[PDB]
User: Fold 50S ribosomal protein L24 from Enterococcus faecalis OG1RF.
Amino acid sequence: MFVKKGDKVKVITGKDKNKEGVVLAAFPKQDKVIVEGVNVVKKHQKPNQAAPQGGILEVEAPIHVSNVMVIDPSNGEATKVAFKEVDGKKVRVSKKTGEVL
RNA sequence: AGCUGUAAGUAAGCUAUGAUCCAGAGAUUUCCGAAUGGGGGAACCCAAUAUCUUUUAUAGGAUAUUACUUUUCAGUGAAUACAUAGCUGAUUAGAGGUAGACGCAGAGAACUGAAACAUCUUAGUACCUGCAGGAAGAGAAAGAAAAUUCGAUUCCCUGAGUAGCGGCGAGCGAAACGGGAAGAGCCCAAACCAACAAGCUUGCUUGUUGGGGUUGUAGGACUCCGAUAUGGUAGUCUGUUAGUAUAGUUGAAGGAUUUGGAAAAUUCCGCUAAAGAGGGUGAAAGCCCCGUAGACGAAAUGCUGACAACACCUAGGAGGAUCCUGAGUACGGCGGAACACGAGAAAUUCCGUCGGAAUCCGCGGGGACCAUCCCGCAAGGCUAAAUACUCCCUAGUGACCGAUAGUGAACCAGUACCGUGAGGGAAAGGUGAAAAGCACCCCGGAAGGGGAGUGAAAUAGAUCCUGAAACCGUGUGCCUACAACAAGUCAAAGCUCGUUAAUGAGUGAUGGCGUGCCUUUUGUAGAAUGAACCGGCGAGUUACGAUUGCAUGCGAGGUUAAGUCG
RNA sequence: GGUGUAGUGGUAGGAGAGCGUUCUAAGGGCGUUGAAGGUCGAUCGUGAGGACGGCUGGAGCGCUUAGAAGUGAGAAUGCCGGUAUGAGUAGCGAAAGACAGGUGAGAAUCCUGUCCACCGUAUGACUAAGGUUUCCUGGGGAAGGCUCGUCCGCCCAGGGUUAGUCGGGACCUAAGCCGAGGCCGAUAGGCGUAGGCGAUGGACAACAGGUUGAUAUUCCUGUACCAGUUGUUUGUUUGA
RNA sequence: CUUCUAGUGAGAAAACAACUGCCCGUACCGUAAACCGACACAGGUAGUCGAGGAGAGUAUCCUAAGGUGAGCGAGCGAACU
RNA sequence: GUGAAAUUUUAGUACCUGUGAAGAUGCAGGUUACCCGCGACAGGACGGAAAGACCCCAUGGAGCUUUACUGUAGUUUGAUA
Assistant:
């Protein structure tokens, strides 16, 4: 999906613009992604098997995948991603000076 | 790099030793149904014969085989002796469905038009039945014509609403010449000659296989010599490659600022294009995501070319003694039909019935019939393309619809529902960017509500976008219990307000005048006709011809049709 | 442009010139600092009609010039939908109940009792069609029930039907039906022989009692019967 | 079912014991609120059983075994039907 | 307690004598009459329900008759195979 489940990522659009975080889960075929600490939401649960005291709880919500950008692990600036011919495990070979991501 | 459909919810698991997913080839495939071992009220019931299994044994389980017809071969076989009916067995093919389409045949209406109706029209249309094919049908002159000819069939333009047909009425309605798309030709019978069998006429009569031979400028046989080579195919599940359909790969270029919950919007300053087609993203993006222009790719299976093999087919010149060239056929009388042609002066082509030729010194046609001239050679077979149609699969397109529209059906629709049955047949789309879908408290059995919270917004709370009218309520400024009112209009005191600012707005005691709307009628308030009310839908259009007015281009001239490239 | 003079009721019907709706092209524009749509106003033009302002609303839409049309609604005893009036009106589908006590948020209507009343060749018991889960147990009360409801043939969750001998098949045939060959006939097909299907009839071996919340000639107890199978108890000529 | 022969055709009669015996239906309503009548509808629905007194009787009235009080009520006690 | 229907242009819906498509709640001139209901009766609303079944028309249908026209199945008689 051009973004994987273990991955550091920066946010382009939507109220968390400029935040970073490690990807938490990938949902292909709906093209969304959960990022750590990024789209916090407040629910209201009644007691059930998990947390028999259901308070007002807060977890992340999935954002759309094109609101996101990969970060080169070694250098730290967000990059568009391209594919090139290494010994034939084709990996995302970063733009912005041809390094492996 | 995630995954176990819709589909939430939980429980158990799988995957970097490559899941899930995608394309080619395989394997498995209960029962009904042509249904085919026998039966039957479809999805059930009951067997026979062999091999194998459970049991000490019977009962029980499994696997194969077993319809009918045809067409080939053996065995058995008889009223009736020889053998043919028959019977048993082995072999060969059919059988049913559909694409509510397109084709060729058999049989074959009516309402309707003729301002009635019989001939005629509707119309050889609708319906029913047979046979197909990927196309069918037609197709290689017993032809079209009229001097000077041309050469198989089909389709389009034109000829032309002409020549004709017709209770000569309503109406029906050609063809050839001329211009184009596509183009292609072939095989038998007969005479004769051999091999075999029967009649052994031991005459050569019957036949079976092979050869020869295919036409009108007449051709062949037959006798004479030449040659014994050369031109082609509408052929094969044979090889060699080339492409192609069915998965995929890669693919340029942006940040800050203002307003917002959120920018793709605004303002600055950049970059990219063989890519500014389109879709998505919290609002409107060439530069965020999927793509696009361009470049690349197939283990397997199927298609289409090309070139190779293999299979088939194809010769001249002369002679004119004799033989061959499709018989109950052509044709004629009688009765019907088909030809645009309704018996007509009726040629041509078919069907039923009866009669019935000739043989190259011949036979047919040129719209009754004859003579002369001209063009052909029936009574045997096959054949690509140019033309018709779309159940279905891929890729797209639209001065086509947008939930009473568009399919009957945007949603679990040929469904619910209705009918014994054949058959008839609907209604019903939209929270939000994201479920963040209201934890906790209070009234109440609950339903429902009020706070508090989510959220940019809840009067976006699931009967959830917007939220019109009929219709039902609550509150108020002004009027109303001596008054006969198609309900308004003109005149007007009092009270209450204060506008798109101008000769202001609401209500109104009291006074004059005044019999709705539509349709059809000589004529309507009509006791003539229609409407409960509100909302939606609901009626002179298009194709091809003919005529007139206006307008433009050419002008004694004007203009192209089918078709070809695009 | 001025000025004079003359004219300007109208059904059938002829002629002219315009208003508004949707879509296409080209040009110039607007929009989350809020488009279309909805609602209100005391505004403009000779008419169809055009603006501007408030409130609502949340994503698209005007203007100019030309083009194309499923282009305008008050009426068809029109079609579909929604809602009125008649009106809190007719009716609530033959019949005897009363009281005490239970349950419950709530009782004329549900439960338990007592007395009273109704049918009794049926309004009692069993069965073939037909229906198809309506049967039993535990919960429920939004709709169905002509009132009510704590109740139910309603709704949710679980559960119930046991055969050598009963009724049907592995037995028989009636009417009628089907029919290998056959005979007839534009097609399709019509009839019919051998042989079959087809009960409402023929044939054919088990009874009495007990037991569940729901089955009993089916389960259990006792005592039987029918058809087979295994074991231990003479010449297929035929007198076996 | 019972006889008689024709008939491929070792030798089966009957004692005890113990074994074998398949498929379909089977709940519940059924003179009814469960079937046919659009309805929890004063209609229709084959067959067997169907008691007592008085009576010829399955008539008639009252009852036995069994079943039932019928799915809108409380008042008033006019016209009229 | 529950809860319909046929109907309906809008209605603040009197009487007499006239007028008028010639029999008026609504038009003229008069006469009478405070506002809103309940139980009853049927004179009027040419009352509701059914685009007259009576009568005539459409160069409308359909069923029937016959010495109306034109045909035909069936029966019969001749020629010919």
Notes: DSSP finds no helices and ten strands in chain A. Residues 1-101 of chain A form one domain. Residues 49 and 55 of chain A are 13 Å apart (CA to CA).
